[PDB]
UniProtKB/Swiss-Prot annotation:
UniProt Sequence repeat ranges: 7-83, 97-174
GO molecular function: aryl hydrocarbon receptor binding; core promoter sequence-specific DNA binding; DNA-binding transcription factor binding; enzyme binding; RNA polymerase I core promoter sequence-specific DNA binding; RNA polymerase II cis-regulatory region sequence-specific DNA binding; RNA polymerase II core promoter sequence-specific DNA binding; RNA polymerase II general transcription initiation factor activity
Domain of life from the UniProt record: Eukaryota
Residues of the full protein shown: 159 to 337 of 339
Record's protein name: TATA-box-binding protein
Family membership: Belongs to the TBP family.
UniProt subcellular location: Nucleus
Presence of the UniProt keyword Transcription regulation in the record: yes
Noted disease: Spinocerebellar ataxia 17: Spinocerebellar ataxia is a clinically and genetically heterogeneous group of cerebellar disorders. Patients show progressive incoordination of gait and often poor coordination of hands, speech and eye movements, due to degeneration of the cerebellum with variable involvement of the brainstem and spinal cord. SCA17 is an autosomal dominant cerebellar ataxia (ADCA) characterized by widespread cerebral and cerebellar atrophy, dementia and extrapyramidal signs. The molecular defect in SCA17 is the expansion of a CAG repeat in the coding region of TBP.
Subunit description: Binds DNA as monomer. Component of the TFIID basal transcription factor complex, composed of TATA-box-binding protein TBP, and a number of TBP-associated factors (TAFs), including TAF1, TAF2, TAF3, TAF4, TAF5, TAF6, TAF7, TAF8, TAF9, TAF10, TAF11, TAF12 and TAF13. Part of a TFIID-containing RNA polymerase II pre-initiation complex that is composed of TBP and at least GTF2A1, GTF2A2, GTF2E1, GTF2E2, GTF2F1, GTF2H2, GTF2H3, GTF2H4, GTF2H5, GTF2B, TCEA1, ERCC2, ERCC3, TAF1, TAF2, TAF3, TAF4, TAF5, TAF6, TAF7, TAF8, TAF9, TAF10, TAF11, TAF12 and TAF13. (Microbial infection) Interacts with HIV-1 Tat.
Location, primary (coarse class): nucleus
Role, per record: The TFIID basal transcription factor complex plays a major role in the initiation of RNA polymerase II (Pol II)-dependent transcription. TFIID recognizes and binds promoters with or without a TATA box via its subunit TBP, a TATA-box-binding protein, and promotes assembly of the pre-initiation complex (PIC). The TFIID complex consists of TBP and TBP-associated factors (TAFs), including TAF1, TAF2, TAF3, TAF4, TAF5, TAF6, TAF7, TAF8, TAF9, TAF10, TAF11, TAF12 and TAF13. The TFIID complex structure can be divided into 3 modules TFIID-A, TFIID-B, and TFIID-C.
Tissue expr: Widely expressed, with levels highest in the testis and ovary.
Length: 179
DNA sequence: AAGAGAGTGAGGACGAACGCGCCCCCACCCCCTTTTATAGCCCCCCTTC
């Protein structure tokens, strides 16, 4: 096809294996913000990997914003080490990528009206609710946002191969509906 | 041969039962938050005349 999706967001969850005191972490952590009224977790952000991590008192943490699997793990390790430096016995257990988000352009306009008619069983096109077309890929469990401008967003993938496979499947379909 | 007490028929007030709710407590789910690209829609605020 000549176009490879670019991972825009990587969401991974890891378990530190230790109950945490959210109030203590916020008071000591450099970039952590805690608001039990708003959310029950602790939001911490770092610059070099450019990721945001939510820390829960149960010891489980969710890292988001990473643009690659390697960055996500490194960012998650940095958050885990920071909590460890605060006096907790934080570890790195069962690190897993929960969701991957990719974006790409087909370099041509797409007729969403024709696409949904031919793929009604997978396409839900409601301009009132959202201008983009929501395509739910089946063989890969991937949900794709196809837009008239040609931009395509892939989400719900657990591994990078799923993103590339999903885009490969959809590209010929989109090519047939070129405007 | 004559008094209180009583049988009977008969009317009037009261307690337990029957509903008939209005309030409550326990599952179940949803929502909160964060990240990201995308495009359209819409709202608040600023500026020009």
């Amino acid at each position: 096809s000549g176009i490879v999706p670019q991972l825009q967001n990587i969401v991974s969850t890891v378990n530190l294996g230790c109950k945490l005191d959210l109030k203590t972490i916020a008071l000591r952590a450099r970039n952590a913000e805690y608001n039990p009224k708003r959310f029950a977790a602790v939001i911490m952000r770092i610059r070099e990997p450019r990721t945001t991590a939510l820390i829960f008192s149960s010891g489980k943490m969710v890292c988001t914003g990473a643009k690659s699997e390697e960055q996500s793990r490194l960012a998650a390790r940095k958050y885990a080490r920071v909590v460890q430096k605060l006096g907790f016995p934080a570890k790195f257990l069962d690190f897993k990528i929960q969701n991957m988000v990719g974006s790409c352009d087909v370099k041509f306009p797409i007729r969403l009206e024709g696409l949904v008619l031919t793929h009604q069983q997978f396409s839900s096109y409601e301009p009132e609710l959202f201008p983009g077309l929501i395509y739910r890929m089946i063989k890969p469990r991937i949900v794709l946002l196809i837009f008239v401008s040609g931009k395509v967003v892939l989400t719900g993938a657990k591994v990078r191969a799923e993103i590339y496979e999903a885009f490969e499947n959809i590209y010929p379909i989109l090519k047939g509906f070129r405007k």
